[PDB]
Design a protein around this ligand. Structure first.
Ligand SMILES: *[C@@H]1O[C@H](CO)[C@@H](O[C@@H]2O[C@H](CO)[C@@H](O[C@@H]3O[C@H](CO[C@H]4O[C@H](CO)[C@@H](O)[C@H](O)[C@@H]4O)[C@@H](O)[C@H](O[C@H]4O[C@H](CO)[C@@H](O)[C@H](O)[C@@H]4O)[C@@H]3O)[C@H](O)[C@H]2NC(C)=O)[C@H](O)[C@H]1NC(C)=O
Ligand SMILES: *[C@@H]1O[C@H](CO)[C@@H](O[C@@H]2O[C@H](CO)[C@@H](O[C@@H]3O[C@H](CO[C@H]4O[C@H](CO)[C@@H](O)[C@H](O)[C@@H]4O)[C@@H](O)[C@H](O[C@H]4O[C@H](CO)[C@@H](O)[C@H](O)[C@@H]4O)[C@@H]3O)[C@H](O)[C@H]2NC(C)=O)[C@H](O)[C@H]1NC(C)=O
Ligand SMILES: *[C@@H]1O[C@H](CO)[C@@H](O[C@@H]2O[C@H](CO)[C@@H](O[C@@H]3O[C@H](CO)[C@@H](O)[C@H](O[C@H]4O[C@H](CO)[C@@H](O)[C@H](O)[C@@H]4O)[C@@H]3O)[C@H](O)[C@H]2NC(C)=O)[C@H](O)[C@H]1NC(C)=O
Lengths: 98, 131, 127, 107, 124, 315
C-alpha cells in the first residue's frame, strides 16, 4: 500500500508493480471495485468507469512488471484509493487531491 | 492470502438445533474445496464430527443421525458459506465448532485421506454454551 | 488533404550537414505518409524516400543510405530532412508531399505510392 | 531495380498531339500515377490508377496502358500542357518507387 | 474389473482387480517420416524400462515376497485386512510412492541376499 | 484412430485453470504465427523510459482458415477427458474418459466470441473462475454454431435472440431466481475490444457489437447488418505492438463463419439481483488459450503397485 499526494489538474501516474517481470491479467479499480481498465494480454481495455477519458495505462512496462495508470486533468473526484489488482498481492495505491 | 471466518457467538436452549457458518475468503466452490467439520469440547481436544465432501451431508457413526452438513456454495459477491446442523443440543453439546477449507482439485501432493483431509486453515472458533 | 510549406533554399559545402523542414497544415498529420522528392536540374527525378508520419519510418534510397536522415515532428507538424556527405549534384529542389493514405492508425490503409498534394520546393544548393 | 519515358526531346508546336510514355524495368499492370511537373515547380497529379483520371484533371489527358509500358495521350496540346511529365509505380514491396524521365512540351 | 471402473475404500481388491486384469494382461513424397521416429523412441524407452525391469529381484506378479522387511514402523496391517478393496488418489500417490520405496529396497535386498548367498552358499 | 477409454464410477474433478496442457498450446501458436503470416510492421517497446523497437518484413496475404489440431502425448502421459453435462470449469466430472490424444479441437485465435470452436452443454455453460464476481472474466462457450455472414456482417436476429435467451436463463439459474438481466453496449477500449476480430476469409472485419446487446429478458428479424471495418493496421495480438498488412484482394469480402463462444465483460455494480447488466469485450489470448483445452490433465505411469502379504516366495 502506498499513499500518494496530488493536486487538482495534475498528470499523475499510479503504478501497478508485481514481483515477477511478466505481463498478466491486471484490473485497475476504484474503491468500489469498479473496473477502471485492464488488458486482454496485448490490448488496452478501458473498463466501465467514470475516469474512462482520464485514466490511461503505459504499454511498454507491462512486460517490465508495471501496469500503471496515468490520469490527466486530475480532480478531487479523481482522488480515490485505486486498486492495483496484480498477483493477488494488490498494491492498492492511495491518492489525495483536495 | 486466504482467511477463514466462522459464525459468531451463539447460546441455544437445551434440546435444540444449531446453524453455524463457515465463510471462506479466497475460495471458489465446495466442489473444489470440501469442508470437514470438527467440534471441540471447551478447553479440551478437537473431535472430528464429519464432512461435506462433494456436497455430501454426512458425519461419523458417533455423530450419525444427529449431525448433517450443508455447505451453501456462493462465490464472488459472497464467499463459500459452509453451514452445520446439529440437532438436539443438550447441555453436553456445549462445544467449540470448527470448519476447514482445503482444496480437493489438487490430487497428487499430500492433502487428503478417504475424506479426512489435511487441515491447512481454520476459522475463528465458536464457543456455544447450551443453556 | 494537407498543405505543405518547406524551409528556405540554403547554400552548403560538399560534405556538410543541412536540415530541411516541411510544415504541414490541413487534415490529420500523422495519418498521412509524407514523401520527399528531390528535383535534379533538367532531368528525371531521383526517388529519395517515403516517410509514414505515425510510423515515423523514413524510407531511403539505396544510394542515399547513410547520407540522409529524414526526421519528423508530430507536435509542430514539421518533417525535417538532414543531408550529410553532400555533393555537387545534391543541389536540387526537394519536395515533401502529402497524400490521403486513409487510416494508418485505425483501419483500412493501402500504403499508397501515389502523391496528390505537394510541398513548395527547396533548392538546397551545395557549393 | 526500377521509371523512364521514351520521348527525350519534343519541340512540337502547341496543338500537335504530343508523345508521353512511361517505361519501367518490371511489369506493373495495375498501379501507376502520372504527374505534371513544369520545370522548377511541383508535379501535378494527372492520372492515378493508370485507367482513370483525377479530380480537376480534364479529359485531354487520356493516359492508358496495361503492363510495364504506359502512355499518356493528349488530344490537343493546350497552352497549359507544357511541362515535364512523370509516372510512378505503386505496386511492389518495399516501396522504392522512382519517377519517370520526363518530356518537355516547349513551344 | 475395469480400467478405472470401481470406487471403494483401500487396500485389497485392487490387488484382486489388478489380479484379474493381469490374468488377462494381453487383451488377446509419399507416406510417413515423422511417425516412425516416435515409434522408435517409444520402443527404446519401453525396452530400457524392460531391461531395468529385468535386473530386479522379484520377477513375479501381484503376489510377491522380495526380501526387504516392511518393518513395524511401516507395518500396521492386520492379517485379514490386507486383502479387501482399494481405490483412493492423493492418498494413492503417497501409497504408490510407498510402493516404490519398498520396491527398490526389496529388489536391492533380494539382489543382496542372492549376491550374498552367491558368495557364501556354495550349493553343490 | 483417436483412442478413448471411458472411466466408470470415477468422480474425477477438473479445473480449467490448472491444466498444464494449456501451457503448451499458446507457445505452439505464437511460434507458429511468427514463422507464419507476417505483418509488414512489428513493434516491441523495450527498455534496452523504454526503447520502442521495430522489425520490418514482408506481409503477403493468403486465404486463411483454421484447421483442427489434436493434441498427442509422448509415451505414457495419459490424458483424461471430462464428458459430464454440468461442467462449471472449476468443477467435478462424473463422466470421465481417458484419451491418448485430444478430441477434434478446432481453435481460433479471436476476440470476445470464440469462432469455429467446440460446444457447451445443453444451453450454454458458465465455466468462469468466479460465476458472479465483478473481478473475473466470464468464460462461456456456445452450443449452436452461430452463422455470421460478412460481406459489414449480416448477423441474424432470431439466432442472436435465442443465444441471448439461453445465456440469460443460464445466468438466472446460476444467479438470481426472480431477476431481470439486460444487456448493455460495448465497454470501450481498442479496435478489437469494442469491435470483434474473427477469421473472415483470412481478413478481420470489425463490427462494434453494441447494436446486438440491448435485449431485456423477462423472468417473471432479417439481418442485423453491423458496420465492420477493413483491416490493414491493428495492434498485434501476439505481444504489445502494432502491425501492417497487404490490401485485400476484394472490395466486398465474402466469407462463411460459424461463431461458438461467449466471453464478455460486465459493469459490476450492485445492481446484484435487482437487474444484471453485461457488456461485450474480453477474449484474452491467454484466456482463449485456456478455453480450448478446458477438460483435461496429464498423468503417467510405470507398471507397479502393492499388497503387503506373507506369501514368501523364493526371490
Ligand atoms: C472469486 O471472488 C472472490 C471475491 O469476490 C475472491 O475472494 C477474495 O479473495 C481475497 C484473497 O484471494 C480475499 O482477501 C483476503 O481477505 C481476508 C479477509 O479480510 C476481509 O474481511 C475483514 C473482516 O471483515 C475486513 O476487515 C477486510 O478489509 C477484508 O474485507 C484477509 O484477512 C486477507 O488478508 C490476508 O493477507 C494479507 C496480505 O497482505 C495480510 O496482510 C493479512 O494479514 C491476511 O493475512 C485477504 O486480504 C477476499 O476477502 C476474498 N473475498 C471474498 C468475498 O471472499 C476469490 O479469490 C475469487 N476466486 C479466485 C479463484 O480468485
Ligand atoms: C461502437 O463504438 C463506438 C465507440 O465507443 C461508438 O462511437 C460513439 O458514437 C456516438 C454516436 O452514437 C458518438 O456520439 C457522437 O459524437 C459526435 C461528435 O464527433 C465529433 O467530435 C469528436 C470529438 O468529441 C471528434 O473526434 C469527431 O471526429 C467529430 O468531430 C456528434 O457529432 C454526434 O452527434 C450527432 O448526432 C446527434 C443526434 O442528436 C445530432 O444532434 C448531431 O448534430 C450529430 O449529427 C454524436 O453525439 C460518440 O462520440 C462515439 N464515441 C464514444 C462514445 O466514445 C459507436 O457508436 C458504437 N456503435 C454503435 C453504438 O452502433
Ligand atoms: C460446480 O459443479 C458441481 C457439479 O458439476 C457442483 O456440485 C454439485 O452441487 C450440488 C448443489 O450445489 C450438489 O447437490 C446436492 O446433492 C445432495 C445429495 O442429494 C443434496 O443433499 C444437497 O442438498 C444439500 O444442500 C442444500 C442446499 O441448501 C441444503 O439445504 C440441504 O440441507 C442439503 O444438505 C444438494 O442438492 C451436487 O451433489 C454437487 N455435485 C458434486 C459432484 O459434487 C458445484 O456446486 C458447482 N459449483 C458452482 C459454484 O456452481
Amino acid at each position: 500500500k502506498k499513499v500518494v499526494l496530488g493536486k487538482k489538474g495534475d498528470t499523475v501516474e499510479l503504478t501497478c508493480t508485481a514481483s515477477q517481470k511478466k505481463s498478466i491479467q491486471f484490473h485497475w479499480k476504484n474503491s468500489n471495485q469498479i473496473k477502471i481498465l485492464g488488458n486482454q494480454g496485448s490490448f488496452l481495455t478501458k473498463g466501465p468507469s467514470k475516469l474512462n477519458d482520464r485514466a490511461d495505462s503505459r504499454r511498454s512496462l507491462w512486460d517490465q512488471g508495471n501496469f500503471p495508470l496515468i490520469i490527466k486533468n486530475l480532480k478531487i473526484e479523481d482522488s480515490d484509493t485505486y486498486i492495483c489488482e496484480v498477483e493477488d498481492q494488490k498494491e492498492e495505491v492511495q491518492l489525495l487531491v483536495f | 492470502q486466504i482467511h477463514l471466518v466462522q459464525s459468531g457467538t451463539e447460546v441455544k436452549k437445551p434440546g435444540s438445533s444449531v446453524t453455524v457458518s463457515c465463510k471462506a475468503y479466497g475460495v471458489n466452490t465446495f466442489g473444489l474445496y470440501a469442508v470437514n467439520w470438527v467440534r471441540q469440547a471447551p478447553g479440551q481436544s478437537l473431535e472430528y464430527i464429519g464432512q461435506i465432501w462433494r456436497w455430501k451431508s454426512s458425519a461419523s457413526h458417533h455423530f450419525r443421525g444427529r449431525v448433517l452438513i450443508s455447505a451453501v456454495d456462493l462465490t464472488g459477491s459472497s464467499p463459500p458459506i459452509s453451514s452445520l446442523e446439529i440437532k438436539n443440543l443438550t447441555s453436553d453439546d456445549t462445544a467449540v465448532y470448527f470448519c476447514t477449507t482445503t482444496s480437493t482439485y489438487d490430487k497428487w501432493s499430500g492433502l487428503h485421506h478417504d475424506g479426512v483431509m489435511a487441515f491447512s486453515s481454520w476459522g475463528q472458533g465458536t464457543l456455544i454454551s447450551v443453556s | 488533404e494537407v498543405q505543405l510549406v518547406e524551409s528556405g533554399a540554403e547554400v552548403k559545402k560538399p560534405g556538410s550537414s543541412v536540415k530541411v523542414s516541411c510544415k504541414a497544415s490541413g487534415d490529420t498529420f500523422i495519418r498521412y505518409s509524407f514523401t520527399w522528392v528531390r528535383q535534379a536540374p533538367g532531368q528525371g527525378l531521383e526517388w529519395m524516400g517515403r516517410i509514414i508520419t505515425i510510423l515515423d519510418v523514413a524510407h531511403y534510397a539505396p544510394h542515399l543510405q547513410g547520407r540522409v536522415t529524414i526526421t519528423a515532428d508530430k507536435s509542430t507538424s514539421t518533417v525535417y530532412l538532414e543531408l550529410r556527405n553532400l555533393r555537387s549534384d545534391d543541389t536540387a529542389v526537394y519536395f515533401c508531399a502529402g497524400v490521403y493514405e486513409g487510416e494508418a492508425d485505425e483501419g483500412e490503409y493501402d500504403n499508397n505510392g501515389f502523391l496528390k498534394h505537394w510541398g513548395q520546393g527547396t533548392l538546397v544548393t551545395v557549393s | 531495380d526500377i521509371m523512364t519515358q521514351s520521348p527525350a526531346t519534343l519541340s512540337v508546336s502547341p496543338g500537335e498531339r504530343a508523345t508521353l510514355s512511361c517505361r519501367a524495368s518490371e511489369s506493373v499492370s495495375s498501379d501507376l500515377a502520372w504527374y505534371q511537373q513544369k520545370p522548377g515547380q511541383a508535379p501535378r497529379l494527372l492520372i492515378y490508377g493508370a485507367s482513370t483520371r483525377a479530380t480537376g484533371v480534364p479529359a485531354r489527358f487520356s493516359g492508358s496502358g496495361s503492363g510495364a509500358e504506359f502512355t499518356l495521350t493528349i488530344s490537343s496540346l493546350q497552352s497549359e500542357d507544357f511541362a515535364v511529365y512523370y509516372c510512378q509505380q505503386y505496386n511492389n514491396w518495399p516501396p522504392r518507387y522512382t519517377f519517370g524521365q520526363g518530356t518537355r512540351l516547349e513551344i | 474389473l475395469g480400467f478405472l471402473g470401481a470406487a471403494g475404500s483401500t487396500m485389497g481388491a485392487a490387488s484382486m482387480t489388478l489380479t484379474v486384469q493381469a490374468r488377462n494382461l494381453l487383451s488377446g513424397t509419399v507416406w510417413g517420416i515423422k511417425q516412425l521416429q516416435a515409434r522408435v523412441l517409444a520402443v527404446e524407452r519401453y525396452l530400457r524400462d524392460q531391461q531395468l525391469l529385468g535386473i530386479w529381484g522379484c520377477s513375479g506378479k501381484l503376489i510377491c515376497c522380495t526380501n526387504v522387511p516392511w518393518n513395524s514402523s511401516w507395518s500396521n496391517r492386520n492379517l485379514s485386512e490386507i486383502w479387501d478393496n482399494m481405490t483412493w488418489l492423493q492418498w494413492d500417490k503417497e501409497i504408490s510412492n510407498y510402493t516404490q520405496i519398498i520396491y527398490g529396497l526389496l529388489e536391492e535386498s533380494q539382489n543382496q541376499q542372492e549376491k550374498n548367498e552367491q558368495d557364501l552358499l556354495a550349493l553343490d | 484412430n483417436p483412442q478413448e477409454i471411458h472411466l466408470e464410477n470415477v468422480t474425477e474433478e477438473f479445473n480449467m485453470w490448472k491444466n498444464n496442457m494449456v501451457e503448451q498450446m499458446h507457445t505452439d501458436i505464437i511460434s507458429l504465427w511468427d514463422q507464419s503470416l507476417k505483418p509488414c510492421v512489428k513493434l516491441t517497446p523495450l527498455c534496452v523510459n523504454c526503447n520502442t523497437s521495430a522489425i520490418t518484413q514482408a506481409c503477403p496475404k493468403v486465404s486463411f482458415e483454421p484447421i483442427p489440431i489434436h493434441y498427442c502425448a509422448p509415451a505414457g502421459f495419459a490424458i483424461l477427458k471430462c464428458k459430464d453435462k454440468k461442467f462449471n470449469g472449476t468443477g467435478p466430472c462424473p463422466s470421465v474418459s481417458t484419451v491418448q490424444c485430444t478430441h477434434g479441437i478446432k481453435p481460433v485465435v479471436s476476440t470476445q466470441l470464440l469462432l469455429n470452436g467446440s460446444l457447451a452443454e445443453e444451453e450454454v455453460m458458465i465455466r468462469s473462475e468466479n460465476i458472479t464476481n465483478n473481478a473475473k472474466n466470464i468464460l462461456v462457450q456456445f452450443n449452436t454454431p452461430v452463422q455470421i455472414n460478412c460481406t459489414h456482417c449480416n448477423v441474424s436476429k432470431a439466432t442472436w435472440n435465442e443465444t441471448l435467451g439461453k445465456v440469460v436463463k443460464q445466468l438466472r439459474k446460476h444467479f438470481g431466481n426472480n431477476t431481470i438481466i439486460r444487456f448493455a453496449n460495448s465497454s470501450g477500449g481498442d479496435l478489437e475490444v469494442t469491435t470483434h476480430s474473427f477469421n473472415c476469409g483470412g481478413e478481420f472485419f470489425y463490427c462494434n457489437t453494441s447494436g446486438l446487446f440491448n435485449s431485456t429478458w423477462i423472468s417473471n428479424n432479417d439481418s442485423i447488418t453491423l458496420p465492420c471495418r477493413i483491416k490493414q493496421i491493428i495492434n498485434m495480438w501476439q505481444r504489445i505492438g502494432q502491425a501492417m498488412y497487404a490490401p485485400p484482394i476484394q472490395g466486398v469480402i465474402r466469407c462463411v463463419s460459424n461463431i461458438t463462444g461467449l466471453i464478455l465483460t460486465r459493469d459490476g455494480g450492485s445492481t446484484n439481483s435487482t437487474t444484471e447488466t453485461f457488456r461485450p469485450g474480453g477474449g484474452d489470448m491467454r484466456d482463449n488459450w485456456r478455453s480450448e483445452l478446458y477438460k483435461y490433465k496429464v498423468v503417467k505411469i510405470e507398471p507397479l503397485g502393492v499388497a503387503p502379504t506373507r506369501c514368501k516366495r523364493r526371490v
